[PDB]
Design a protein around this ligand. Structure first.
Ligand SMILES: [Ca+2]
Lengths: 503, 505, 505, 502
C-alpha cells in the first residue's frame, strides 16, 4: 500500500532494552518468584522493548498493605489539600521534564505513533496539573438554617485504598485520568497496568517517588490479568476498584467486588456513532469520521465505530472519506509522519480480522482495507471501511476495537437517534450539523455520556467523562472524579442539648 | 415476668376488625397477581389478627411492572416534562399524604407494629420528604464551561438514570419509600417499588396517591410479594437501569452481585452497628435520654440504631443509672396505644433471632443488666428493653447487627481509644458523639468512619442533608441534593461551533 | 384616525364601580399615614375612574416601617427559624396568590392599564415565583473545608443581609415584588416594600397575604407614597442594610450614590435598549411574531423590551411585511376586555414623553411605517403600535429608552456587524438572537454584552434562571439560586481545634 | 524600653535606592510630565528608598485604554482557562524566585519587619498559585429541565476592565488577593498602589510581563489619590473599581462610581473584637491577643483592636498579655528578630497617639505603652488600655496602631451584644473550649472574617470580606471569581416558541 510506512528494526532506540521493577511502599522490587514478562514491540517484530515482574497474589497483597498503612497511619490523608497539591504539581513538572523518554516508552510498548505519544504525554502533564489545582479546593457543605440549636455539616473525606486497573490502549493517559483524582482526594493507590504496557506506569510511580509523595501512597504492580484483578477485587483492605477495559472483564470484577460491598468505578467499551446530517460542514465531517475511527488504530473506547449518514450526503461524504483513508500515513510508530500505528498483539489483530470476515459474510460491502499489512515487519491492519451495513449485523453492534468503520444511512433526525441508541453501549457519540435544533436536540436524545458536536475524540480535563448503559459506572475527571474517590459524611450537630425523647 | 411499663394490647380494638385488602399498581391500573395468589399480614402487636392482604407477584407480574416503567420512560410524558411540572405533581402527593395522615399512620402501625404516635409523626415527616424533593427537583442543574476556547463550549447536561427498581424494608416502609421515590421520579426517572412482604399497605397507598395526584401511568408502579422473584427480576431485567436496595448486608450483597453482571447501577443502604460515644464532659441527662432513644427507637429495628454504647470510664456509673431509670419506665407494647413509645417485633422468626443474640451475649460472659426476654407471649410479639454491660469487642453482640432493643455497653479511657473501638467494625452507617468540648466533639466525629453522624443528638435528621454509609453499610448517597445525583446520568458535551482543525493535514 | 384593532373602553363595565382604599402595613398592622394624607390612582385605561387610594407616607412613616423590619430581624423569630419553617409560610403565600388570582389580576389591570388576560397570567407566574423561592429557601448552603490541616476546619456560613428596602416600578408591580421579596425573606431578611405611587394595590395585598399566611409581624412591611421621601429614607437610614431598586437609570444612579455614602449594599435592575437580531436563516413567521411580542408586550413599557430590531439585509422586506400584518391586527385598548393584547400608557406625562421620542424620530429622518399618535384621547391613555424603519445608530430613537410601543429598525449584513450594533449602547439588560444556525446563534449570544439573553424567543423566562444587566442596566443578579446570594452575607470561619502555634517564642 | 531594637543607621541596604516606572500596555514608562514622588523609609533616618511617577489623569486614561484594548481586541479573554492558568503559575514561580528582593522592598517602604515581609511574599506566591488552579475550573450552569423545546444556559464571562486601588499597609498581599482573581476571570486590570508603597506592585506587574502575560492585561500606574482614583471611578472604559483602604475614601469612590452604575468592590476598615471565655486555653489566647493587636503594628483592618474578656479570667489573661507585651521585640524593620515594625507616616503615628491621649481623658486605664519612641524613625510602644466602656472613642473608632481596648463581660449574650455594638463588621475571634459557646457565639457575631481559637492567619481557600460598613463583596476562594464575573442567563428555544399573536 502506497500510504504504508515500513518500520526500521535497525533504529537505535530499539537497542535500549529497558528493564523495570514494581514500586511498593517506596521501594523498587522484583516479584518474590523473580519471574518476569517481556514486551515485544508490536510495530517491530521480535524486538523486546520492556520487561517487568510477573507478580504473584502475595506480591499484590503487599502492595495493598503498603497503601493501607499509608492511608491509616501515614501523613498523606492528614496533609492539607494545599500540601497534597504542591507534590502533585511536582509530578506534572517531572512528566514534562521527561516527555521524550516517556513518549518513546508508550510508542514502543503500545505501537502508538510517536507524534501521537508525545502529545499524549503533554496532555497527561496537564491532567496532573488540573487535578493538582482542584485538589486543594475540594469542599463539602454547611447548613446554617436547620434550626437555631443545630448546625448541619457535610464533610468530604477520602474513600481510602483504591485499586486502579488500566488497559493497554492508553496506559499513561488512563493512569493520569485516575491516579491524580484518587490521591488528590486523599486516597492511597495500587495501580495495575496491562501486562503489555507497564513501562510508563512504573515510571509514573517513580516520578511520584522522586516528587516525593510519601511511601505507599502510589504503588504499582505488574503481571497478568488473573492474579492482580481477582486480588484487588476481593482483598478486604481495598475500599474501591477503578477498572478501565472491556465489558467482559469489567462485569466480572464488578460481580466479585459486590460480594464485599466494595465501591466500583468502571470505564468500559462502546460502539460510538458519529451522526452526519446533510447540512454539516462536509470537509470537516469527513476528516472527523476518519479521525474518529483511525485514532489509535481504532483501539479506543470512544472510537467513532459507526458512521450514521443522512441519505443526501452519503455519496459526497463517502468520497471524501475514502480519499483521506487512502492517503493517511500508517505503519512505523517511530516515524514522525505516522498517523496510525500498530495493533497491540497478534490475538487482538486476529479478533479485528474476524469481525471484518463476519462483515463480508453478512453482506456488507467492503470498500477499503480488510487485511493485514507488512506482516513480516510487525502488527499492522489496513484502514477498513464497510458500506451497506444494517443494524442487526454483528459489525454494527459489537466493539471491533480496530480501524474498521461500519456505515449506515438514515433519512430523518428521529431515525438517527433511534439507530444511535440501538446498542447496549453508551460511552460516546458525535453529531455533525450546522443547525442549532438538529445538533442540540440530537445530542440531548442520545444516551451516551461523552458527546461531541462538530468534533470527535478531543476533550478537556475540565469536563467529566463516563458511560451510560453497559459502557460504565461513575464519572471521572473535572470536579466529578473527586466525588468518585470521596466519601461524604452528613453531620447533624446539636449545640447544647436536644429535646428529650423520654417525657 | 410481667413488667409494669408493658402496655397490654387490646384484642377488642375496632381498628383490627377491618381486614384491608390491597392490589398492585401497574401502568395506572390496580391489579392482582396473574395467579390470584395473596399474602396475609398478621399484626405483630395483636396475635392472630389479619390486618392486610396483597398479591404474591410472580416473576412475569414484575416484568410487566418493569415494562410499564420502561414505556413511561421511553414514550411517556414524564421525563419530557419540565422540572416545574414534575414538581407540582409531587407537591400534590405531599398534600395528599397530609390529607390521609391518620389513615396512613394506622396502616403503618398495624403492619409494622410501630407505636401509633411514632407512625403519625413518620407520615408527617414523609409529606415533608416529598415537599423537600418536589422543591429541589425543578432546580436540578448541570454546568457550562465557557472558558475552553472561543471556538468551543462545554456543557454538562443532567438527565435521568431511567427505570429504577426500588426495594424497601419492613422497618420503615413509608419513610424509605419517601426517601427514594421522590428523588428518583423528581430526577425524571420511572420506578417499580417493591416493599416488604410484611408491610406493603402504605406503599400501595402511596402509589395510589400519585395516581390520584395525576402522575402519568407507569411512572410509579408497585409490586408485592416475597423477596424473590421480585429481587432477582429487578436485578437482572435488561429494562431496569438501576436497583436501589435498602435492607440487610446479606441480601444487598447478593443483589449487587447479580446487578453487576449487566453493569446495572446499584444504590445500597444497609445495616450497621452504630456506636454512641459519651465523654465525661457530656450533658449527662441529655446523653442518657439519647442512649435510650438511640437503642429503643423502633424497638431497635433500625439501621441507624445506637446499638453500642462507648462510655468514658467514670461517667459510666452515673450514665448507666440514668439510662436504667428511663428504661424501667418507658412505655412499650400495644402499638395502638397513644402512650406507647416502643412497639412490637416484626415477626416470630425475628424475635427468636434477637433472643438468640441475647443468649449468645450471656454465654459470652456479658453482664445482663435489664430485660433479655419476650413479654406478653400470648398477646403478640414483644421483646423487653435489654441492656448488657462489660461487652468486649470480640463478642458476637459487640460485632453483629441484632436489630432488637438490645444495647451493648463498653468503656474507654481516651478519645483515641473511643475512635479505635468505634471503627472496629465492618459497618459504617451511623455514629453519635456526646461532648460539650469543641475539640473532642469535632475531632472525634471527623475520625469516625460512618456516613450518618450526630453530635449531642441521635436518630433525628433532615431531608436537607445526605444519608448513606461507609464500608459495608452502603453504596451511594440519598436525600438532600445528593439523592438526585444518584438517579441522574451526566452527559459531557464538547461543542465545536464551526469546525475543528483538521486531523488529516 | 380610528384603528379597527382599537378596543374602546366600555365605561359600563361593572368592575369600574369598585372603589378601593388601601392602608400601609407596618409591624403587622394596617395603618394610615400619620397625616392622613392619601394619593389617588385614576385608571389609565378609563378616563376619570378612581381605582385606588393609599397613604402618602411621610419620612417618619417610612422610618417606622424600617424600625419594624429592624425589630423583626434583630429580636423576632423569622431569621432564627429553619429554612423549612420559612418555606412552609412562603408556600402558604403562593397558595393564597392562586386563591386570590382573579381579584389580584383585576387590581393590576385597573391600576397599571395592563390587559386583564396578561395580568391574570402574571399573577399565576407570581405564584410560581413564590413557590420556586419557597422550595429553594430551605436548601441554601455554605461550604466546609475539611482539608486545611488536621488541626483546623474551615466553615463558610450563609446568613441573611438583614433589613432590605425594596423599591418597585409601575410597569410590573406584582411581578417585581415577587422576584425580590421571596428571595430576600427566604434568605432570612426582613423587608420594607415601596411600590410606585401609581400602582400600590397589588403590593399592599401581597403584604396582607403574607400576614394572612402567618408570616411574623415586621418581616414584610409595605409603605406607599411619592418617590421621595421613601426613596431617600431607604437609601440613607442607618437601620437599612440594603436597597434593592428597580426602575430608571436616572433614579437608580441617584439612589446608588446616596447608598454609597454609608456603604449600604445596592441591587439595581434598570432600563435597557434591547436588540432582537434576526438572521436571514431565521424561522421568519416565528421571528416576526417574536418581534411584535418583544416591542408591544406591556405596551413597550418594559425594561427587557425588544425596542431595536437589527435585521439581516436579505430578509428585511419579508420580515417587515409579516411584522406589519401582525401590527395592523393586534388588539389594543380596553384593559378590561379579554381580547385586548396591548393596554394603556401609565400616565399622561409618560404618553407625552413617548410621543416626544416619536416626533424626534421623524425629525431625525427615520421612516414612520405605522402608528406614531395617541388613540382614543377622550376615553383613556393609549398610544398606537409604532414602527420606524431606516434608523441609524446616532439617532436618539436608536439610543434612548422610549418605554412605549415604538420599534426602531436597523439592517446589517454580517454577524460581526450585528454584534457591534447590538453592543453600541450604554445599556446591557436583554437581547434576542433569531437563527437556525448553531454557530451564529450561540456565537452571537456569547458576544452580546447583556445579562438576559434569548435565542429564538423573547420576554418569556423562568424562575430557575438568574436575571440582571451588564453595563448601566443593573448591579447584581436576581432569581434562581443567584437572588439568594444577593440577600445573603457569607461568613468565613477558620476554626482551630485546640491551640494554634504560638506567635511569641 | 529594653524590648526595643534601635534602628541601625548604617545598615547598607538603606543606601541602595530603587527607582520604578509605571507599566502600561507592556511598556515601562514615566509620567508624560516626568514628575516623580519619593518614599522615605519610615523606620529610619530620612533615607529615600523608592521613587515612582506622579501620573496625570491622561496617563491613567492611557492605562485604562490599554486594558480596554487588551479586553476588547486582545487574546487574554479569548484564551482558555488553562492557558491563563499556566501564565499565572509562572508569576507564582517568579514571586518565589524573587522572594528576598520583594521582602526587602516591602520592609523598606511600609516599615514592616523583614521576617514578616518574607512570610507575606511567600503567602502571595500561594495566593497566585491557588487562583491559577481555580481559574481554569470556573463554570456556569445548564438547565436541561425547562421544557423539551428549550435549554437554559448560564454563562460565566469576565466583567471586563477592573481598576484596583490598594492601601499602604499590605501592598503586595492585597494586589495578590485581587489581581489574580480578576485576570483569572478573563478581566484586564489597572492597578493603583498607594503613593507610599508602589515598589512591590510595579515589580508584580513586571513579573507578569516576564511570565508572558499579554500586553495591557496587567497595567500599573502610580501617584497620589487623585487624579488616579477619580479617573478609575469616572472613566466609562472602566467596568469595575475594587478598592481597599479606609471607609472615608471607600465611601467617596463608591459615590462617584454609582453615578455611572459602575460595579464596586470595597474592603474597608474594622474594629475587630476577640472574645475570650473563662474556659479558653489561657496561654494560647493570651498569645493570640498580642498577635491580634500587634501584627503589622496594629495597622491592620482585621486587627483584634477590642479585647472582650469574661470576668474571672480577666486577671490571669491580663497578666499573661502584659508579660508578652513587655518582652516582644519591636523596632528596626531590618532586624530578623523584630516582631513589630514602624508606623507608616508622621501624620499616622500622631493619629495613633492622639487616640491614646483621648482614651486617657475619657477615663480609661493605661496599663502599658502610650508613648512615641525614637530620634531617627517613627515608632509606637505596645499599648494596652483597661476599663474601656462602649461609648469611648477608643472603643468605637479604628486606631490602626498597636493599641488594645479591653472591656469585660459576664455572659455569652453580653459578649455578643458588645461585639456587635459597632458600625464595622470585618473580623472577630472567639476563644473557648466549649462547643456550644464557640460556635453559637461565632454564628451570632455580624462579621465576615471569623476565627475560633485563632486570629489573623487565613487561607486562600476561604472567602474574605466585611459586614456593615467594613465592605461590599467577597474576595478569595471561589468567591473572588464571582466578584470579577458577569453571569448571562440564556433561554434557548430549539425550533420555535408558541406564537404570541394567535
Ligand atoms: Ca368608578
Amino acid at each position: 500500500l502506497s500510504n504504508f510506512i515500513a518500520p526500521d528494526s535497525n533504529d537505535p532506540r530499539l537497542r535500549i532494552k529497558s528493564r523495570y521493577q514494581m514500586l511498593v511502599d517506596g521501594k523498587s522490587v522484583d516479584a518474590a518468584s523473580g519471574s518476569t514478562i517481556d514486551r515485544v514491540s508490536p510495530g517491530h517484530a521480535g524486538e523486546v522493548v520492556g520487561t517487568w515482574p510477573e507478580a504473584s497474589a502475595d506480591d499484590v497483597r503487599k502492595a495493598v498493605a503498603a497503601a493501607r498503612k499509608a492511608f491509616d497511619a501515614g501523613p498523606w490523608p492528614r496533609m492539607s489539600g494545599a500540601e497534597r497539591s504542591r507534590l502533585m504539581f511536582k509530578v506534572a513538572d517531572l512528566i514534562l521534564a521527561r516527555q521524550e523518554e516517556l513518549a518513546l516508552i508508550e510508542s514502543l510498548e503500545v505501537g502508538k505513533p510517536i507524534a501521537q505519544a508525545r502529545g499524549e504525554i503533554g496532555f497527561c502533564a496537564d491532567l496532573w496539573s488540573y487535578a493538582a489545582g482542584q485538589a486543594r479546593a475540594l469542599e463539602g457543605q454547611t447548613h446554617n438554617n436547620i434550626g437555631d440549636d443545630r448546625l448541619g455539616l457535610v464533610l468530604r473525606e477520602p474513600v481510602g485504598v483504591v485499586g486502579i486497573i488500566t488497559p493497554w490502549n492508553f496506559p499513561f493517559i488512563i493512569a493520569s485520568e485516575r491516579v491524580p483524582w484518587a490521591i488528590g482526594s486523599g486516597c492511597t493507590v495500587v495501580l495495575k497496568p496491562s501486562e503489555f504496557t507497564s513501562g510508563t506506569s512504573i515510571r509514573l510511580a517513580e516520578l511520584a517517588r522522586e516528587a516525593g509523595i510519601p511511601d505507599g501512597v502510589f504503588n504499582v504492580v505488574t503481571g497478568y490479568g488473573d492474579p492482580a484483578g481477582q486480588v484487588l477485587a476481593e482483598d478486604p483492605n481495598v475500599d474501591m476498584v477503578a477498572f478501565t477495559g472491556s465489558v467482559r472483564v469489567g462485569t466480572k470484577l464488578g460481580e466479585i467486588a459486590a460480594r464485599t460491598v466494595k465501591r466500583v468505578g468502571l470505564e468500559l467499551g462502546g460502539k460510538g456513532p458519529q451522526i452526519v446530517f446533510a447540512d454539516a460542514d462536509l470537509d470537516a465531517a469527513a476528516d472527523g469520521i476518519a479521525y474518529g475511527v483511525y485514532h489509535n488504530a481504532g483501539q479506543c473506547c470512544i472510537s467513532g465505530s459507526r458512521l450514521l449518514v443522512q441519505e443526501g450526503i452519503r455519496d459526497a461524504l463517502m468520497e471524501r472519506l475514502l480519499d483521506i483513508s487512502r492517503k493517511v500515513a500508517f505503519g512505523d510508530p517511530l516515524n514522525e509522519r505516522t498517523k496510525i500505528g500498530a495493533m497491540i498483539s497478534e490475538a487482538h489483530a486476529e479478533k479485528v480480522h474476524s469481525y471484518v470476515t463476519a462483515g463480508i459474510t453478512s453482506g456488507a460491502e467492503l470498500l477499503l482495507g480488510g487485511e493485514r499489512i507488512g506482516r513480516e515487519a510487525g502488527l499492522y491492519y489496513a484502514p477498513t471501511v464497510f458500506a451497506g451495513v444494517t443494524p442487526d449485523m454483528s459489525i454494527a453492534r459489537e466493539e471491533i476495537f480496530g480501524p474498521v468503520l461500519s456505515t449506515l444511512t438514515f433519512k430523518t433526525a428521529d431515525e438517527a437517534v433511534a439507530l444511535a441508541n440501538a446498542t447496549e453501549f453508551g460511552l460516546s457519540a458525535s453529531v455533525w450539523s450546522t443547525n442549532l435544533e438538529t445538533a442540540l436536540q440530537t445530542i440531548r436524545r442520545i444516551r451516551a455520556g461523552r458527546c461531541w458536536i462538530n468534533s470527535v475524540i478531543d476533550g478537556t480535563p475540565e469536563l467529566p467523562i463516563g458511560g451510560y448503559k453497559k459502557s460504565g459506572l461513575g464519572r471521572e475527571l473535572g470536579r466529578y472524579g473527586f466525588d468518585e474517590y470521596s466519601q461524604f459524611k452528613g453531620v447533624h450537630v446539636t449545640l447544647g442539648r436536644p429535646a428529650p425523647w423520654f417525657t
